[PDB]
Design a protein around this ligand. Structure first.
Ligand SMILES: COCC(=O)Nc1cccc(NC(C)=O)c1
Length: 171
């Protein structure tokens, strides 16, 4: 059985219990913590690409009001995010299973951008999601996995200083 697990869930849960925030910039900002995924049960000899996207967890705009995140009252449908191709793709199962798959080079932006960078809407709440695509083979296959522990609100600057402090303490 294909098993997908979160590396350093310990640390992600500290961020999550405070409400996690990720900076987005016009040029694109890398994530901290970095999404690292433990993968077992692939065919060592089969070929796979790892894809990352961000699901809008709800349809609302969020605001930091008197030290607390609170949703707007006017939902709008959230067009799905673009997909980030893990730069080590495509690769043998063996490659993906020999160390945690680390999305250290994805950059989060607030502006439609040349390439690489993934555009998010600021003050929306996002749930990271990967797709493992079996490629080259006759029988194309996709397995998807969500990481609730890694939810965050996209922000142009940090609102909750407890987050600012965790980010610095653990970077
Ligand atoms: C929007 O389409 C999503 C996508 O990028 N698919 C996709 C699937 C499998 C492999 C690759 N490309 C590499 C470089 O491995 C791309």
């Amino acid at each position: 059985e294909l098993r997908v697990g979160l590396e350093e869930s310990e640390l992600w849960l500290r961020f999550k219990e405070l409400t996690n925030e990720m900076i987005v910039t016009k040029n694109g900002r890398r994530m901290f913590p970095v999404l690292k995924v433990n993968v077992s049960g692939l065919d060592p000899n089969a070929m796979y690409s790892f894809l990352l996207d961000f699901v809008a967890a709800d349809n609302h705009r969020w605001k930091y009001v008197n030290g607390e995140w609170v949703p707007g009252g006017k939902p709008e449908p959230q067009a799905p995010s673009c997909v980030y191709i893990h730069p080590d793709s495509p690769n043998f199962g063996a490659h993906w299973m020999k160390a945690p798959v680390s999305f250290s080079k994805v950059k989060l932006t607030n502006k439609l951008n040349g390439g690489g960078q993934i555009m998010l809407n600021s003050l929306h709440k996002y749930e990271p999601r990967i797709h493992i695509v079996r490629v080259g083979g006759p029988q194309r296959m996709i397995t998807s996995h969500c990481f609730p522990e890694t939810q965050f609100i996209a922000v142009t600057a940090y609102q909750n200083e407890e987050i600012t402090a965790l980010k610095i303490k653990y970077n």
